Amino acid sequence: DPRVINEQLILDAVKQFNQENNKITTENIILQQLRQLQLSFKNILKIQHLQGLERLEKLQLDNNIIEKIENIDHLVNLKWLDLSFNCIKKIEGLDKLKELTDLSLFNNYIEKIEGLHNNTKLNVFSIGNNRLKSYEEITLYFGYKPRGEEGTNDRPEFKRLQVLNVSGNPFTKDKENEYKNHIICAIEGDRQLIRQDEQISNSYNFTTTDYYQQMQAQEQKEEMDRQTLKKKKDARMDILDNLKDEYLKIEDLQRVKIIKPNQINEEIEKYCGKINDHVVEMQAAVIQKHQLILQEMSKTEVSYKEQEALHEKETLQILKEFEHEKKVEFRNWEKEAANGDAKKEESRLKTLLQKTTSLKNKLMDIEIQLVEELEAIFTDYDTKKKETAWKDIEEIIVLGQKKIEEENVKFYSNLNVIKNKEEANYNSTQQQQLEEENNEEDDEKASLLENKEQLAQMIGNIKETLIDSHTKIILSAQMELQKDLAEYAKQQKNKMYERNRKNISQIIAQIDAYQTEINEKLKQGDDESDHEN
Amino acid sequence: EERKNLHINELMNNHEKAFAELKKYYNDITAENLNLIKAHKEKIAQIYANIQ
Amino acid sequence: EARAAMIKQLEDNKNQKIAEIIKEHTQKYNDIKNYYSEITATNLDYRKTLKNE
């Protein structure tokens, strides 16, 4: 009989699992705080009633009649997966989960392997005991393909994957153990043993030593590219990436390209190249400024760390002094309680309590000095940043924006000159020939040239729109820098607020504990005076 | 884990085939039923009627 | 040693599972066989009536 994994069944499975591993008997098991789920042999026919488990780390559904997989997109934080030995025929629905590492699809109807490009980090995959037809299938997942097939997969999709068994597949019963060697040459001790067979190493060209040297080189290139990307973004000039793509957002440029395509493309290339080089110098200077600003900030946290540590060391020394005070006071308390001289005991105890209030006052004073020091440090650093780094970025952005403006103005002037020359050439030529195949493009050029004022206004609008878009992107980068710095300062100050609140709460709690303990000692010493009458 | 799951699969298939064996054999033996009793009782009734 | 502890824990769990599966299948087989055995004994006791008739 077909069934469903229901939340009543959910609780039943939770109870069985907790029994299996002696988990705390809590009926109030938070359903948003689930990590591992076992569903051993429920004969489960479908997967349902599991929404909300984005934090899942372990899961098991072996020994069931499940046959289809899909909608596992919402679960992207899974680690331990075991769904083998089911009615599976295809793999899909998991394209969003990258964090899984244990993939079990053993002993199913699996014949096509697909959907694991996103989870390149997988290291365990069981798809053995299947109906798989071709060995080279697996080759597609480790950056190796049979020679002679057009393969657009020039980027390997599985590197750390070192757990993979398909043993028992249909083709795996032919030419014993040759297919394993072939796949491994495209893919732990078994690997060393297979690599030592002469035919295994002779039959291919792309080995593992060279593969790993290339891997290290490629990963170094990737890391340098990522650092360059972060550099450019922190320069805030990333938004200008469409500046050279603006013309493809500028239709009037396409319309005007008809008049003289050759020199139009030539001037466009000159304009793009110069704009690119000077804008690049722009973000390079901005990057220097932002890097020194980052150093400024990091030294800010460093200085806060040293000064704070000084504060806690002084506070801890004073607190150790008062703990010694408490211990001597309690020792004398017990000694005189054996003595029973209540008057002197309570006198020394109020002496201690006044000392405790003194500790409260001095600790609050320490917090006050903390406030002065942190506030002065923050104001000084903010003024330093404003005076040097913020102003340098300001000037660099101003120079870069007006340099882009210089390029735009010169480009517009060159466009004006080319338009005037084309107009003059058309005016000269129109007086000799009046019949040539009624050319469509010739007629379009004639119409564009006749309305010379129309062309002038179109190019002027083109330049004004280009300058406006460039200026708006420039100001968007400037506002990005403004908001970034503002959020930095705001987070630092607010976090200082919560830190101050937390430390004051701790001080109040300790003073309250001291006072309550002192009162307990005094009250017991005094109550010891109520049996003697 | 995979080795023991396959071992479980082998055990389950073995026990299932044994269950099918027992079902088939015992139900084949059950294929002969009480119809002989009805035939013999109709026989006794008919014999007594012929005697009358 | 942690690997060994994990290995032995999972081995104990799945050995329990193996033994218990074997057990309940054995008892199920016994129940079915005994049911049919008593049925057959009753039929054997019953056919004597046909023979006497």
TrEMBL record, chain A:
Keywords: Cell projection, Cilium, Coiled coil, Cytoplasm, Cytoskeleton, Flagellum, Leucine-rich repeat, Repeat. PROSITE patterns: LRR (PS51450). Residues 335-362, 419-458 form a coiled coil. The keyword Repeat applies. Its main location: cytoplasm. It is found in: Cytoplasm, Cytoskeleton, Flagellum axoneme. Gene3D superfamilies: Ribonuclease Inhibitor. One of its GO terms (cellular component) is cilium. It comes from the Eukaryota. Belongs to the DRC3 family. This is Dynein regulatory complex subunit 3. It comes from Tetrahymena thermophila (strain SB210).
Automatic annotation (TrEMBL), chain B:
It comes from the Eukaryota. It is found in: Cell projection, Cilium, Flagellum; Cytoplasm, Cytoskeleton. Belongs to the DRC4 family. This is Growth-arrest-specific microtubule-binding protein. It comes from Tetrahymena thermophila (strain SB210).
Automatic annotation (TrEMBL), chain C:
It comes from the Eukaryota. This is Growth-arrest-specific microtubule-binding protein. The chain holds residues 211 to 263 of 472 of the full protein.
